[PDB]
Symmetry: C2
Subunit: 186 residues, 2 copies
């Protein structure tokens, strides 16, 4: 009847990347929960934009989501990488064959929590040396999908990233109409 | 020696275009003030994302900004169009020789306030009929500049819109570095 997405909002997140994934997913008819990393309070992002989450990560820790989305930004990614809760939830998503999606610096969260080893991914270019030892790093793609893992490079790739997630959950036709309304070629 | 931008955040604002404007301008070293239309409280956006403004529009009313930026979204544009304070600041900005930038449905804000009549502009494609009478509408163009007016079309043109404003205020070398960091060709 419906597909869900958990979007984790962490202090120091790249707000553009975050907002694009939340907003595009909602456009495509997906039920998006924005879960604040440390609570239900406003999250101060990387360029000082403050965003109210829908709820806390902790409050949706017993729920299943068709996709777990990790926005990038160095500080948001560092916070998610240190969070034992993010680790538990990511291992859970991997073992239920659910989608994991990470953009920009956020794929280092996968490395930090031992998730999705041996898969192909990309990231923001400056994070590559953290991601070559246990993953096949892709240098030449804006978005990479390998089994249940979708990763992407940064702000210039965030619309394509969100649309690719949307396409897996909501289908081709829906995403075509969504992309048309965005004025995004896809 | 810095430059300044007022970004007006209004209820029903298209959050992506809003966040992209605030973030990209901040990356370019421009002092950004995010000012809530109706006060300093959180603003609910078109897709239910809630954003805390830096301050209220009312509180920056005697301030001079090098640019006044209007994000789009239909609810947001309609609210701005009804606001006498928006009108007053657009007119003052216009008399003052300062920059005005409006994306998506936001150009209709200038129509509602009788601002920049006869100027060349674009908008979200379906909003064209609202604009053809009193403006010189340009169909096939992502970002349109006429003197101190900059307009653009939608989410898919938001980066270029923001980078175009950034370039006017911060210069070519700065915006090239910012575009490089964003992974946006510009």
């Amino acid at each position: 009847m419906s597909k869900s997405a958990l979007v984790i909002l962490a202090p120091g997140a790249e707000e553009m990347e975050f907002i694009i994934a939340a907003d595009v997913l909602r456009r495509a008819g997906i039920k998006v929960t924005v879960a604040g990393l440390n609570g239900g309070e406003a999250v101060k992002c990387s360029r000082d934009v403050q965003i109210l989450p829908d709820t806390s990560l902790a409050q949706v820790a017993s729920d299943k989501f068709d996709v777990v989305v990790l926005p990038g930004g160095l500080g948001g990614s560092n916070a998610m990488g240190e969070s034992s809760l993010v680790g538990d939830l990511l291992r859970s998503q991997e073992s239920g064959g659910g989608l994991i999606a990470a953009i920009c610096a956020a794929p280092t969260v996968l490395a930090k929590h031992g998730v999705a080893s041996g898969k192909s991914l990309t990231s923001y270019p400056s994070m590559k040396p953290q991601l070559v030892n246990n993953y096949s790093y892709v240098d030449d793609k804006t978005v990479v999908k390998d089994g249940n893992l979708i990763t992407s490079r940064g702000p210039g790739t965030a619309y394509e990233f969100a649309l690719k997630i949307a396409e897996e959950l909501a289908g081709k036709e829906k995403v075509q109409e969504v992309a048309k309304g965005l004025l995004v070629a896809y």
